[PDB]
Design a protein around this ligand. Structure first.
Ligand SMILES: [Zn+2]
Ligand SMILES: [Zn+2]
Ligand SMILES: [Zn+2]
Ligand SMILES: [Zn+2]
Lengths: 141, 689, 689, 141
């Protein structure tokens, strides 16, 4: 749990080491040090996040802290915004090959969401080098 | 001869046509062939062939004959109007340049036209052609610039003037305002993008020195909350690419910072008529967020003057200041903390340096993002809400105390009236960070300082080490003492016995002896290494002697200005005008933009009797007056016109002196009985303070 | 006969022309005269003369002959196109109506055209004419409406249908969106302004009763800070004029509240195609701030349906909620207080009424502006950030406890399933304020309640006392017991010995005897005063018996809804649909607008197996499901389509029941193995809760 | 100082009762109960405000409190906005005859400021029945 190349990073990989499942695992939040709810654990697994190790313990992030600090990083570290076509030209790759997370919940965008960004001419925001979009859940009236 | 089976032209094959057409009285076949081959791109690619495939001299000499007759010129004028819209659509969709590098041969042939400068092309020929050359790919632009860098000063000046007059003409004729933006115009933007090409040709063609760079800037570590969030996202192993750099500066590999002496002075590329119609609040947004078809002129900062560029940096600082207000509101809402939206500083008057040092160095560790809040300095034992009045007083106080020769940080040269870093003082690294932060906080919070440095200081701040040629201002006597050494026509190793080891006096008065190489006194100075001794004496004086003092000074300056576009918009020459102000006191401009409130009007009896007293003030008394009302003795960027002074009425005729509200540049003037009484109180108010 | 020297037409002078032209084969002079006099306003003012100066019958009878021939109709069609643009410019600058009231004679002649309903006028004739009649002054409009009020039901329906089809046609043909607004259109706005004219004609022509008004609303006193600021400004002696009232409602002197039974049902003026293209966020701003040429449709609320009007009230409440967030931020910045942007309510589960009463009555005195903050209710001993989940639970809890028959505040009628105020309970005025506030807080915070009142309660809330005709729902047995008295054909003073003194049973079971006048048992009921006894028995039952109970109920409701446009947009019939919801459960609409997240998709194996279980739920089980996911058993205004339900995946196949997040209408559904397992867990989740 | 028809309302009228001038009068703030600065007294006289009496004492308003509570009343009691021509039609009077104060400092608008409002097509805001504009001092870049 000390060498990064040895300790697990993703939640499914971690669950095997403690001989538990994704169904009855107990995790704390890296920020507020409070136990994660079951739906919070499932969201952590679904949002493709990485386990953070501090003093040899596995830590996750709950929903409130994740959304709060995503908002703070959006406010404090916003660099610039670009269109989808400009981003594709700049990286010379299709939008499916890029890793774009939601600006509010850090969920990687599905190809349908990137297509919606392209069709609605919505801009992708560069936040401290991380390209961000906006998922379907966070973009509902 | 029909002359209907030609597709390209060379020097001799057009000379023969001219010769055969001279004997007749028509001259029409020449017009027909010129309008047929010069109106088609495919004809121009293969025309005048011999990294370029067209001979410049052949194009230059043929144009000296074809433009002799008036009617032949009109063919060239009309040919460009027909050709450019094809090339604009050809370069946008067909992706032609990658197929053949000979497509660029089109634009060199056109750009060598002698009459492009003539006012007849400003209507429809030149604006459309600039649209075609604005859509070239980065590969074509980079090699096009290199060919133009081989021109001399006159050719570059002509090429620059071609696009300058188009920019002025499109602004003089049209009317731009807050609703009719300059950015959406398709002619100025294409002409400005085309003016950038000759700008980098001027940069490359001048004296370019690349390898004399400083160490990379020490990037500050973000807060622990941002570090923790990076590990969750899995992007903690890769860093941000860095500042936004012009994509044309990458293809060429040469930046404006490298160019020491360009072929043309950099101030000649500024388009003043463009600046007077530019809205810098809307231009900044187009710089950040890519809007549909709006072009931000901050992407070409060479075209903006000091006043306009200062506004663009102001908006970037203010927007970053607002974002720290939103975050503090969120912390009080969600986390239930106390609302503190300010970079509050509590300092004593007798210990300005000591108090501001233990507070700013603490913030630089616990909350490194607090330096981007609005500055709010309050003095201990005094009460008042600081709207800018106390910040101006604090900025004047710390500067006038840091540069005290008794503190030992800076040496004063009474001849050139400039300060230089003192390498003698040790263990004072923390203070050198304070003066670096204060300079950054002055730019960030928009206050001008009274700081006198040589231009080398503003060059090392931007990342360029001081070379020998920069010694003329820092150490004037050592420059001529070393210039004469190179200029000496006779032998140098015998007339004087100077070795490669130098002597320098200190504060203690003990001349220490420094060896540039391993052993100095063991090696004499010879003509072969005559240039080498200078290149190491200057390097030590400017860089090696004060490395630790300047490392902390540069580190502090970088903690406040790292994300600002300061390194993008300002050359080292323009940094001094930004940190400090202009010393010229144009009191006519101050009168023009002065507003009145509280009953006073522009043509009141006292107001008209007030402007007749200041206009008769001497140079010293004009400085005292500004220090009383503004808090600074200097004028802002531009002039006193930008200092929107306000005169407010303060009650009836009294024996109370005028009072000033320096936060908003407000002078509270009682309605005195006569003019002479006004002068006596005004003189007493500005002298005692 | 040239017929080139005529300037006006009467019945006989056009009948003679028709008779003389019938014998020929031309019929052209009639077309010429029709197109000459009906195309000029000055000719129409003096035409067909006898507060109106044109005889309606003469116009009606001549039109029955002229529109017989097809070619003659086309003259009328073309005459309107030529005439209206003159009148539009004539009424805008010339100020003609004040000179002569006979100018209005123009529009009555036109509006009596039989073929205005025909689809041939929807292109250019009718839209331009509505522009002319949209610019009439308030004086002309008021008297024009009065003449139309004398029409019968069929004539008003035809007149309304004329402007309705123009509104639908201009929306069906065109495409309106967020960028092509409906408001800036010059045809729909003029047609809607013209539809308002026939709306108030319908209101006046119906049964109008004005004098039966309640007492004026007790205007709450603003905070001491606003009172102190008023004294400084010197405007402390005059009050605000009050709510925004339609300027047409002032000229006529009759409001929609007075009209009991109009000539046409009020729901027939709603234009559904207009509502489906209306952006209510932009429409609200045009309602507040007068923009250049944008017309807000909230100025004509009769044309919006319940869903659209509910959105307009929602935006007004939310904007007022935001303003209380700005003020709290200012108080923490300037005054250094604690950030409290919520109407926080700490209540216990076993003492919901007692806790919510001692808190809301305290706020109604110390900080009367705190009632306009967003509601944030939290239960004691339980932790959680209320996004709307706890407010929905609290609103359901307080209503289900206030209407408990044991509390004694409301009586339940098991026949009509409606509650009525109980006049027996005394010293419970404070609670009646709570239920009034809760109803106001439900509208303000956008939560629907399960409250069953007769329509008279929503009429007295709006300011109209309950009359005899409103007794059919409140006291059904007393209505027929009194209707039979009036319907009795024989003598009434002898067959039964009922006097003017009544008997009413109480909670104690002691029938108290009440005298309507000074002495009841001393006066028998006669046929002359047969109607008088009913008019006082009904008045006492609805108004006098519960005056103190309803005064506090109305006072509390007014503390939260005084500045809202609630009294402007909603008639008493539409208030019930706003406070409560619709009981119809159209689960097909719920499926149509359901979104999925967490891995589920619309066509997943379980999602498709989930919609087959709810569609087979009985009526009772459909109600339980909504109470589990939404927090209410009822549907919002409109239907379940407006309830944007979300189904989220919750881990693998487990034995854990589904969970709901009622704040955002989210059902957390585990991916169960089969359909039968899904049904068992879904049934267990909604029944136990 | 009890009957409103007897006690003075404006500052110049008040100054005579205490036998003082506008030059050396001492006044407290009705809100913060702090002495008014000399420029604050002159601004109070210039802004045409009324003396507020509480428990028989003459009170004025300082600049900070006046601006704060004007801002609060603008936020809390804003009714609607109208153009100058619409306001003139509604009141059937010239704009010079109406009493319009600045929305930020409660200074009655001079005819030049109302003319500027008319020329720039700026709207007058109705705040709890008091029509408000924006003076030249508060409308400067
Ligand atoms: Zn947490
Ligand atoms: Zn999201
Ligand atoms: Zn105060
Ligand atoms: Zn003002």
């Amino acid at each position: 749990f000390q060498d990064p190349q040895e300790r697990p990073r993703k939640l499914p990989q971690l669950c095997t080491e403690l001989q538990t499942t994704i169904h009855d695992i107990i995790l704390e939040c890296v920020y507020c040090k409070q136990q994660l709810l079951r739906r919070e654990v499932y969201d952590f697994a679904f949002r493709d996040l990485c386990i953070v190790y501090r003093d040899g313990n596995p830590y996750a992030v709950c929903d409130k802290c994740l959304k709060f600090y995503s908002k703070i990083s959006e406010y404090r570290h916003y660099s610039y915004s670009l269109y989808g076509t400009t981003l594709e030209q700049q990286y010379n790759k299709p939008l499916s090959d890029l890793l774009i997370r939601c600006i509010n919940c850090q969920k990687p965008l599905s190809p349908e969401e990137k297509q919606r960004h392209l069709d609605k001419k919505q801009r992708f925001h560069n936040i401290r080098g991380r390209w961000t979009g906006r998922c379907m859940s966070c973009s509902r009236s | 001869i029909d002359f209907k089976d030609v597709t390209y032209l060379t020097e001799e094959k057009v000379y023969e046509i001219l010769e055969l057409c001279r004997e007749r009285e028509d001259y029409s076949p020449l017009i027909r062939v010129i309008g047929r081959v010069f109106s088609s791109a495919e004809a121009l690619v293969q025309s005048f062939r011999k990294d370029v495939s067209v001979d410049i001299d052949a194009i230059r000499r043929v144009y000296t004959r074809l433009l002799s007759n008036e009617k032949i010129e009109t063919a060239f004028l009309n040919a460009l109007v027909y050709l450019s819209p094809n090339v604009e659509c050809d370069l946008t969709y067909h992706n032609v340049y990658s197929r053949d590098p000979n497509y660029l041969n089109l634009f060199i042939i056109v750009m060598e036209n002698r009459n492009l400068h003539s006012p007849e092309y400003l209507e429809m020929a030149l604006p459309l052609f600039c649209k075609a050359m604005s859509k070239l790919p980065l590969a074509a632009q980079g090699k096009l610039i290199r060919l133009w860098s081989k021109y001399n000063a006159d050719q570059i000046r002509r090429m620059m003037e071609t696009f300058q007059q188009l920019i002025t003409y499109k602004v003089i004729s049209n009317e731009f305002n807050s609703r009719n933006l300059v950015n959406d115009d398709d002619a100025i933007v294409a002409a400005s993008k085309c003016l950038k090409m000759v700008y980098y040709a001027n940069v490359v063609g001048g004296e370019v020195d690349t390898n004399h760079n400083e160490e990379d800037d020490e990037e500050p570590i973000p807060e622990s909350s941002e570090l923790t969030l990076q590990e969750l996202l899995g992007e903690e192993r890769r860093n941000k690419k860095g500042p936004r750099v012009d994509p044309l500066e990458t293809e060429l590999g040469v930046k404006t910072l490298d160019c020491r002496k360009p072929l043309i002075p950099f101030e000649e590329f500024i388009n003043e008529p463009l600046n007077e119609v530019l809205e810098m609040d809307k231009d900044y947004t187009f710089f950040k967020v890519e809007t549909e078809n709006k072009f931000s002129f901050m992407t070409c900062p060479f075209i903006l003057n000091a006043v306009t560029k200062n506004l663009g940096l102001y908006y970037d600082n203010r927007i970053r200041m607002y974002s720290e207000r939103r975050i503090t509101v969120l912390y009080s809402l969600v986390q239930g903390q106390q609302l503190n939206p300010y970079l509050r500083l509590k300092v004593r008057r007798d210990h300005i340096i000591d108090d501001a040092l233990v507070r700013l160095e603490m913030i630089a560790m616990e909350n490194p993002a607090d330096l981007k809040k609005q500055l709010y300095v309050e003095f201990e034992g005094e009460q008042g809400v600081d709207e800018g009045g106390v910040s101006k007083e604090f900025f004047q106080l710390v500067v006038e105390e840091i540069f005290n020769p008794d503190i030992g940080m800076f040496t004063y040269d009474e001849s050139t009236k400039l300060f230089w870093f003192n390498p003698s003082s040790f263990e004072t690294e923390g203070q050198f960070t304070l003066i670096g932060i204060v300079l950054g906080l002055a730019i960030y919070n928009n206050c001008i300082l009274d700081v006198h440095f040589p231009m080398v200081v503003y060059r090392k701040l931007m990342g360029k080490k001081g070379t020998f040629r920069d010694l003329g201002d820092s150490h004037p006597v050592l420059y001529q003492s070393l210039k004469d050494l190179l200029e000496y026509e006779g032998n140098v190793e015998d007339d004087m016995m100077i070795t490669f080891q130098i002597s320098q006096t200190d504060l203690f008065g003990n001349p220490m002896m420094y060896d540039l190489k391993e052993n100095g006194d063991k090696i004499p100075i010879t003509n072969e290494n005559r240039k080498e001794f200078v290149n190491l004496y200057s390097d030590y004086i400017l860089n090696k002697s004060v490395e630790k003092q300047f490392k902390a000074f540069r580190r502090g300056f970088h903690m406040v200005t790292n994300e600002s576009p300061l390194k993008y918009l300002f050359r080292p020459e323009e940094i001094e005008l930004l940190i400090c102000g202009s010393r010229n006191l144009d009191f006519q401009a101050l009168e023009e933009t002065t507003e009145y409130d509280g009953g006073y009007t522009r043509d009141s009896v006292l107001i008209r009797e007030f402007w007749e007293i200041v206009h008769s003030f001497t140079d010293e008394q004009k400085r005292l007056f500004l220090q009383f009302t503004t808090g600074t003795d200097r004028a802002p960027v531009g002039g006193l016109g930008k200092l929107k002074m306000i005169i407010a009425k303060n009650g009836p005729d009294t024996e109370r002196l005028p009072t000033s509200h320096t936060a908003f540049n407000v002078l509270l003037l009682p309605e005195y009985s006569s003019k002479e009484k006004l002068k006596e109180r005004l003189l007493k108010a500005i002298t005692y303070a």
